[model samples]
Target: FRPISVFREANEDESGFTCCAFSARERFLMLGTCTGQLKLYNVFSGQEEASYNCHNSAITHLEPSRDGSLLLTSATWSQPLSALWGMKSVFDMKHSFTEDHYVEFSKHSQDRVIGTKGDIAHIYDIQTGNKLLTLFNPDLANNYKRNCATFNPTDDLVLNDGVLWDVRSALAIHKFDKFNMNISGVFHPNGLEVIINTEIWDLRTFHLLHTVPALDQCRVVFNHTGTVMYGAMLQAMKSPFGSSFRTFNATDYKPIATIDVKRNIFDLCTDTKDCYLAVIENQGSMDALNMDTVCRLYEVG
Candidate 1:
């Protein structure tokens, strides 16, 4: 058997677009676009599977967590990180998007859901995509120009809607779009974003948890574990090629790893297992990032 598969000419409207993933089985392929339309194709025979018209707005990007049990789709303002319930053998989905770790003080073992946009982060269920809770992260507020969020929960299958604390002022807030808690990415009534500067909520009770600001992040690249988060710092020098990579801990927003590369690394992608990371350096080269290289040091525990 051949070890490498080369892509022939792209089909243009479908294949050539950005952001795509292979289904749990090697058979199905989900192709995404800036338009939020997910083109699911049967790769083996070049046939189209069910095309999910999930988002009314365009999708900015998409990611499937390490285990491939769930799919997170980030649409424009409307469908931010909507859940694509994908799993093997057994799949039970409810509140499809906003998953809860602390339900009325008791936690869950379910893979929860969450959504993140410019200045908000929310938790939910798989089928319902509910906004169980929200958080107002200052990194998005003060550092509007740059910054992002990641999850650090107590258990797996449990979803954390990210934290947003005002590190400078020591004041925290909850940011949400309660009107659209249902995970289907349907339009909301209460308003897309639920807003408050100092409130917390459990994905179950839709109430408060804890709010704190630890470190700053640029954009977070999820680890194969979905639990571990890696942040990359982009620094451009006056020369044509100038780029570097710095890692941060997702649990409490701390820095853990650092690497100086040979050239400018523009974009990054990882396998669903998160064990292997493919860095799109420049435009044509892909660098494999070994998690073990720095994972033990960060120790997501």
Candidate 2:
């Protein structure tokens, strides 16, 4: 009902936050600044735990590994680049000196990782850092890059560019044109559902489940438990702004809660226990270009 905390990047004057992600336990917060610094904080204690100069430019993408021991990062647009960092624990010293071949860890297997470079995606053994197998992107044209990629909860498949690829078969079992330019595929925590371009599909049967609005330009993120999903209000008409998040039940895909925010929202996330909702705000335009950013954490109750 009210904001629990308001935060800005360290040593920066409303310089604009590029991205934000939560650790798996939802006890810590990681923020990426326009100055290319990654800062970690204790969500409840408001303690600064760590900081690292991770990139040369603004960090455009960020996500934590399933167990939250590792953080995956990528540079801003016009530059296709990424890096992986390791942590002893959330509060301990974390470093990344390993060479540049990495992908996110599988949701089910902490020991498995996906390695992507060019058209090939490789599976790796994390404990030994050994290559297991190489998987190829079905669409191998002159050159193309993905803004996002993720493994399903079941850990048997991967989603990229609206296409579902089976890791075992290394073939495209299902390929469909379900989104516009630049689509983000999010797999349900159950690993049986996926939301992409306003549509949710049943991964078990690979069938359409439901259609959601604001699929074009709005940001969508789920609660820590993944039982509920939230999509930012649709940016309709000329330069329309949104201040509420449309929530839906993860089990049945039915409309649920609508958490309000102070300003037009650009992103949504929650603590591991779903105790709070974090939203990214600015005069977030359709293009999302050159806008000052504010991060607000709201009490879920």
> What's the TM-score of every candidate structure?
0.44, 0.76
Q: How much is 213 displaced in model 2, in angstroms?
A: 3.3
lDDT of 1 by residue, 126-240 (tens): 4455555565544434323222333323322212233333322434543343222211111111112111222224444545443422212223455645444443443431111
Looking at model 2, report the run of 10 residues with the lowest lDDT sum.
93-102
Q: Model 2: per-residue lDDT, tens digit, 56-94? A: 777666768776677766654323355556765444323
Q: Candidate 2: where are CA atoms >4 Å away? A: 24-27, 44-47, 66-68, 77-80, 89-103, 115-124, 128-134, 137-147, 214-219, 233-244, 257-266, 283-292
Q: What is the lDDT of every predicted structure here?
A: 0.38, 0.63
- Kindly provide the TM-score of model 2 when superposed on the true structure, using C-alpha atoms: 0.76
Instruction: Give the range of the ten consecutive residues with the poorest summed lDDT in model 1.
Output: 290-299
What lDDT score goes with residue 254 in model 2?
A: 75
